[PDB]
Amino acid sequence: MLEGKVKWFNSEKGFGFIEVEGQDDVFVHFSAIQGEGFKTLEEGQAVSFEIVEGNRGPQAANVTKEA
């Protein structure tokens, strides 16, 4: 998985972008968030994820809150 950083996340709306080096920011939606509990992410937070690309373009998948 890649490892990146939550660039920003709009906790009300439920989406934002991940920063990963040598790629562009990756769009992230709450449904990609792994774990139990309210799905949300903080700016600055480190996460491990994959980028899954279909016909809608690239988005993050399997976001796990790393440290």
From Swiss-Prot:
Induction field: In response to low temperature.
MF terms in GO: DNA binding; nucleic acid binding
Entry-linked CDD domains: CSP_CDS
Alphabetical list of PROSITE patterns matching this protein: CSD_1, CSD_2
Knocked-out gene: effects: A double cshB-cspB disruption mutant cannot be made.
Chief location of this protein within or outside the cell: cytoplasm
GO terms under biological process: regulation of gene expression
Keywords attached to this entry: Activator, Cytoplasm, DNA-binding, Stress response, Transcription, Transcription regulation
InterPro entries: Cold_shock_CspA (IPR012156), Cold_shock_domain (IPR050181), CSD (IPR011129), CSD_CS (IPR019844), CSP_DNA-bd (IPR002059), NA-bd_OB-fold (IPR012340)
Domain CSD residue range list: 4-63
One term under GO cellular component: cytoplasm
One family name in Pfam for this protein: CSD
SUPFAM superfamilies in the record: Nucleic acid-binding proteins (SSF50249)
Compartment list: Cytoplasm, Nucleoid
Oligomer status and interactors: Homodimer. Interacts with RNA helicase CshB when cells are transcriptionally active.
Function: Binds to the pentamer sequences ATTGG and CCAAT with highest affinity in single-stranded DNA, and also to other sequences. Has greater affinity for ATTGG than CCAAT. Can act as transcriptional activator of cold shock genes by recognizing putative ATTGG-box elements present in promoter regions of genes induced under cold shock conditions.
Name of the protein: Cold shock protein CspB
UniProt source species: Bacillus subtilis (strain 168)
GN (gene name): cspB
